[PDB]
Amino acid sequence: EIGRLNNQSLLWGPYRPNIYFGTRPRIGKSLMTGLMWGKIESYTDFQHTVRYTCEQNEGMKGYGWDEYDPRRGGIQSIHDIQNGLDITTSFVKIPGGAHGGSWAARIKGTLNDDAPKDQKTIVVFYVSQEGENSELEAVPSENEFGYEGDVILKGRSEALGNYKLVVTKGKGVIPQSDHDLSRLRGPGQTVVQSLTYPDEVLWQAKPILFQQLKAGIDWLVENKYDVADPPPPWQVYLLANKPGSGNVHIVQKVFEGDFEFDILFSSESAGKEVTSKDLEREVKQATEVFGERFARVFDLKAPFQGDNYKKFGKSMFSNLIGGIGYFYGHSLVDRSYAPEYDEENEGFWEDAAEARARHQEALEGPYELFTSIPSRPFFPRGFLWDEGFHLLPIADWDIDLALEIIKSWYNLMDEDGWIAREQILGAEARSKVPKEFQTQYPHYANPPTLFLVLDNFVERLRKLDETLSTASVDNPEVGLEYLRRLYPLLRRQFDWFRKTQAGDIKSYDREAYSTKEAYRWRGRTVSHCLTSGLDDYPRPQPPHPGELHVDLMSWVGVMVKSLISIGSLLGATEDVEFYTKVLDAIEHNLDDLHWSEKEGCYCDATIDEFEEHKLVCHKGYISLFPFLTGLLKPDSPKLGKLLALIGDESELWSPYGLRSLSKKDEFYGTAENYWRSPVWININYLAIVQLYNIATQDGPYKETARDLYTRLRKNIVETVYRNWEETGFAWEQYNPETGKGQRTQHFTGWTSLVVKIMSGHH
Ligand SMILES: O=[N+]([O-])c1cc(N2[C@@H]3CC[C@H]2COC3)ccc1NCCCCCCN1C[C@H](O)[C@@H](O)[C@H](O)[C@H]1CO
Numbered sequence: 001e002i003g004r005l006n007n008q009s010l011l012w013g014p015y016r017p018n019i020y021f022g023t024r025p026r027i028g029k030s031l032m033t034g035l036m037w038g039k040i041e042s043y044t045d046f047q048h049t050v051r052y053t054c055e056q057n058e059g060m061k062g063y064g065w066d067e068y069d070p071r072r073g074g075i076q077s078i079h080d081i082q083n084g085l086d087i088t089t090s091f092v093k094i095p096g097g098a099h100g101g102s103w104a105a106r107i108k109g110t111l112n113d114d115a116p117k118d119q120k121t122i123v124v125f126y127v128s129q130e131g132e133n134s135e136l137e138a139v140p141s142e143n144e145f146g147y148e149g150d151v152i153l154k155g156r157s158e159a160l161g162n163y164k165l166v167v168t169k170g171k172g173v174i175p176q177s178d179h180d181l182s183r184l185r186g187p188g189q190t191v192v193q194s195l196t197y198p199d200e201v202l203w204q205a206k207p208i209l210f211q212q213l214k215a216g217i218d219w220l221v222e223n224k225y226d227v228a229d230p231p232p233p234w235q236v237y238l239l240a241n242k243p244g245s246g247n248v249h250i251v252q253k254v255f256e257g258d259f260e261f262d263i264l265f266s267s268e269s270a271g272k273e274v275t276s277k278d279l280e281r282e283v284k285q286a287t288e289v290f291g292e293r294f295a296r297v298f299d300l301k302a303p304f305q306g307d308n309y310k311k312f313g314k315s316m317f318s319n320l321i322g323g324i325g326y327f328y329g330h331s332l333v334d335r336s337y338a339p340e341y342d343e344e345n346e347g348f349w350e351d352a353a354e355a356r357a358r359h360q361e362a363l364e365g366p367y368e369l370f371t372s373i374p375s376r377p378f379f380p381r382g383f384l385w386d387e388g389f390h391l392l393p394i395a396d397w398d399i400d401l402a403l404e405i406i407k408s409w410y411n412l413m414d415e416d417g418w419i420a421r422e423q424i425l426g427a428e429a430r431s432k433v434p435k436e437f438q439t440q441y442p443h444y445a446n447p448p449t450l451f452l453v454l455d456n457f458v459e460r461l462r463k464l465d466e467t468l469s470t471a472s473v474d475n476p477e478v479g480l481e482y483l484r485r486l487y488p489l490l491r492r493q494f495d496w497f498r499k500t501q502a503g504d505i506k507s508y509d510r511e512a513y514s515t516k517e518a519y520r521w522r523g524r525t526v527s528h529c530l531t532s533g534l535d536d537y538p539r540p541q542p543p544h545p546g547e548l549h550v551d552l553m554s555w556v557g558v559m560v561k562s563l564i565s566i567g568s569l570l571g572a573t574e575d576v577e578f579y580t581k582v583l584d585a586i587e588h589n590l591d592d593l594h595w596s597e598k599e600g601c602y603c604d605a606t607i608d609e610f611e612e613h614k615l616v617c618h619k620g621y622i623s624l625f626p627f628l629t630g631l632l633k634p635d636s637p638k639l640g641k642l643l644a645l646i647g648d649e650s651e652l653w654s655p656y657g658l659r660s661l662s663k664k665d666e667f668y669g670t671a672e673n674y675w676r677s678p679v680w681i682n683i684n685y686l687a688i689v690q691l692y693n694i695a696t697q698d699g700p701y702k703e704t705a706r707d708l709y710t711r712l713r714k715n716i717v718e719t720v721y722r723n724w725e726e727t728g729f730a731w732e733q734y735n736p737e738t739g740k741g742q743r744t745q746h747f748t749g750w751t752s753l754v755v756k757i758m759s760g761h762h
Pocket of ligand 1: 374378379383385386432433434437534
């Protein structure tokens with residue numbers, strides 16, 4: 001019942017973060033829309049200037065959400081240098097009826113100071129509908145060659161019932177052609193082309209548009225329009241009007257100078273149809289609500305209480321929550337469980353490559369996923385351990401939203417307990433991913449950081465849009481039922497980890513409190529360990545079936561501590577007893593297998609040339625894991641030595657945050673130098689939260705933790721703020737020597753954790 005209200009609230013959104021601006025509902029095969037625009041200055045330039053899928057290069061100053069809440073809508077701003085255009089896309093949801101409500105958008109384009117004042121810009125609104133028993137029709141024009149006013153599309157489906165979608169006339173100069181062609185094509189007006197293609201290719205908006213433009217050009221060629229006397233470019237690239245029935249509708253406008261137009265989606269089962277007056281008003285309302293929620297949910301503490309930090313927090317937050325996508329389709333999975341994937345022998349990476357080279361992978365599904373993403377331009381899709389970080393701030397904002405996303409993720413889990421770490425769903429998603437990197441492998445794990453979110457919900461539980469956001473904490477019954485239904489999958493994931501990611505104690509000269517607790521990440525190559533999330537952090541060389549990884553064991557610890565709390569809430573006492581013994585064994589086994597007294601930190605372990613357990617110690621993030629994951633007692637002498645490592649400028653401590661790897665480590669700044677020195681916000685965030693924990697409890701390290709917490713919070717926030725101020729972007733990682741953001745931009749993305757770091761009061 002709370003489920004039905006949530007379903008209905010979240011159904012519609014701009015859930016296509018892979019494109020600048022578009023809408024889809026959370027339904028695999030339904031109605032989608034996308035925006036395209038580009039300046040036209042010549043006969044050949046439109047194909048190069050036209051924008052649709054997100055990218056980041058010299059031609060685009062920046063883009064992002066100024067404001068967003070997926071229940072209500074928001075405002076995105078796009079700063080396009082190539083096309084001399086500052087664009088604004090406002091989207092708003094209007095609840096009502098039985099079909100997930102109505103929505104509207106305003107597209108406003110303003111030429112920048114550099115653009116020719118008489119620039120011609122082509123704007124397209126592309127609309128598609130998949131589904132066997134559904135209809136969509138453009139109501140024809142009264143006029144001869146196109147539309148003087150609004151374009152109305154009428155459609156129906158099982159999912160949406162009856163609806164109307166209107167593209168309004170809009171404001172702005174419409175250029176007029178004196179050419180001969182105008183007698184056949186009109187002087188210049190809004191046009192509509194209504195087409196049909198087999199459902200599975202409808203997503204290919206750009207090629208479909210261009211095929212129509214080319215047919216347009218070929219008609220000119222056949223009909224004696226030539227270089228003797230050519231029509232203007234904008235008229236050459238203006239489609240001949242042919243509205244009708246189909247599963248594809250192209251709405252094209254040309255504008256000279258500034259422009260704007262509305263898109264009004266009117267769910268028939270609701271009240272009166274949506275108007276532009278409705279849009280303007282609900283835009284203003286949504287802004288007020290966003291304003292008030294922000295100040296309550298993300299109340300930035302000293303020294304970030306100022307307005308500059310507020311605007312920064314709003315940008316980082318809105319971009320993260322604005323990344324929410326709905327994805328649908330088949331994924332590519334190797335279901336061969338080839339025995340080479342067991343990696344039980346020396347040299348196992350060569351065996352595994354030989355297996356992969358059998359190419360037994362097949363598409364399977366379809367699946368759906370509702371998730372936030374790291375990067376609109378470079379990787380707009382679900383990543384398993386990233387989502388754990390993304391949901392930390394989102395959960396604060398709207399716990400029901402976060403729980404929905406968690407549910408969405410767990411619904412992917414297969415019978416054995418595997419969720420693919422990278423969710424590439426459907427041909428549209430695949431288009432952005434080289435074939436060689438699509439295949440998922442059922443023995444590949446990723447950190448279970450979604451348990452971190454679950455933990456915070458549990459603590460919240462112990463201690464209509466306003467209502468709906470917090471319904472899962474405000475009605476303990478609802479909360480518990482949610483945990484009840486998820487609990488088995490959580491448990492299945494726990495079991496899967498210990499089955500598939502088991503390390504080898506019993507087979508070597510290995511003494512420890514427990515014969516059981518030992519873990520090794522499957523999937524390592526000579527240079528990489530992708531499944532751990534820390535691609536190129538240095539690990540034992542060469543890789544070896546005897547390896548043990550202290551990060552993985554610490555994640556199993558995070559998991560088991562969570563199972564304790566959740567089981568304890570559902571009174572699964574047979575389960576809670578078992579967990580209690582596993583936790584106890586990991587605490588002991590962390591020390592017995594992973595602690596280096598001589599180095600003063602945790603290390604991964606291998607097996608020698610001589611068949612004996614060797615620690616292989618590389619000072620950095622990995623070394624801190626038991627502390628980052630909240631496993632050490634606040635009086636632990638090991639914790640204190642870890643605090644020395646963290647605070648030590650010659651090892652990890654840079655002015656800009658903690659270095660992934662110590663400056664003393666032989667691998668510092670080597671090779672791709674991905675996780676071999678740069679400052680990464682996700683691990684810094686875990687550190688900051690654990691420092692705070694120790695700083696707010698009686699113990700011997702209280703005052704040290706307090707100082708490190710104060711400084712690290714400051715350093716991390718200021719580095720990310722400084723870069724945002726100067727570049728407009730959140731970055732993937734930060735240079736510890738210069739403080740510059742580097743690798744990819746638009747990383748929102750766990751970089752956005754900074755809103756919560758500024759927020760404090762963990
Ligand atoms: O998508 N690609 O497959 C892909 C595409 C391309 N492109 C080609 C064509 C378009 C596109 C842009 O330019 C040329 C280039 C390289 C790759 N490589 C796959 C790697 C995926 C990124 C992992 C980022 N993070 C790494 C963190 O280490 C990990 O912790 C984190 O979880 C993960 C997620 O945030």
